[PDB]
Design a protein around this ligand. Sequence first.
Ligand SMILES: Nc1ncnc2c1ncn2[C@@H]1O[C@H](COP(=O)(O)OP(=O)(O)OP(=O)(O)O)[C@@H](O)[C@H]1O
Ligand SMILES: [Mg+2]
Length: 259
Amino acid sequence: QWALEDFEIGRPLGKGKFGNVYLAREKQSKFILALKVLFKAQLEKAGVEHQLRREVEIQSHLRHPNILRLYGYFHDATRVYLILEYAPLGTVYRELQKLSKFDEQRTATYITELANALSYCHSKRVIHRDIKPENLLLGSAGELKIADFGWSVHAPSSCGTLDYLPPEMIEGRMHDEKVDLWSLGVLCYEFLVGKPPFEANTYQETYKRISRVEFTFPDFVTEGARDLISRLLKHNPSQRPMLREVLEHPWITANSSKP
Ligand SMILES: Nc1ncnc2c1ncn2[C@@H]1O[C@H](COP(=O)(O)OP(=O)(O)OP(=O)(O)O)[C@@H](O)[C@H]1O
Ligand SMILES: [Mg+2]
């Protein structure tokens, strides 16, 4: 259905590897939204037309308040256009740059929102695999929305920064839902500390740190946080808590908010 002439394009919202995302308004209804614009050539060269379909299939059909809606799509001679829900307060990545580190209640709140959203996804055998702060968007209430479903896959199943990926994944092995639990632990640490726990100056060093699960806490991280993170960041996937154990963890319950 949709054509480019249906939209007034405005301000650029962000760039990814593939997406060049703009603010946009639909002329008839004046509906503000975001258009994610991708180049067919690029997609063709990098060979990710599958990721495009998954992203469209998965994301058009989920419905949860902490997951970003994709409303539709259309294409040009030259480009593909995804019609997305607009997240007006930007990324958790920009929040963290601006704030440096989050206190325990913002952190806990975000983890709660992530863990419900992921609970919902996993309910449908969907694993996201790319839960990074630049793909975590903020709605008008400051509520966290998971975006960028191009990496998602039905579970189980067999590029850029490695920081959020678990051992089983950077090493090739089979993985399932528990990937998203490891990433939740990396996010929890990053929110509190301000850098992810396996950060390094090189990919190869990072790879080592993840496979050795080589991380330490600064002094200011508290015992309840250390406990949640240590549990999520276990090498062995089967040893990572389910999402309900996360949601009930005394540190989450002590520090997070309800809707
Ligand atoms: N709905 C939105 N509202 C506000 N900003 C957005 C929205 N969608 C994307 N952005 C901004 O643009 C950046 C790129 O978006 P996105 O992650 O969808 O592209 P990508 O990472 O290139 O995607 P893919 O993983 O499918 O190849 C985001 O990290 C974010 O800064
Ligand atoms: Mg992205």
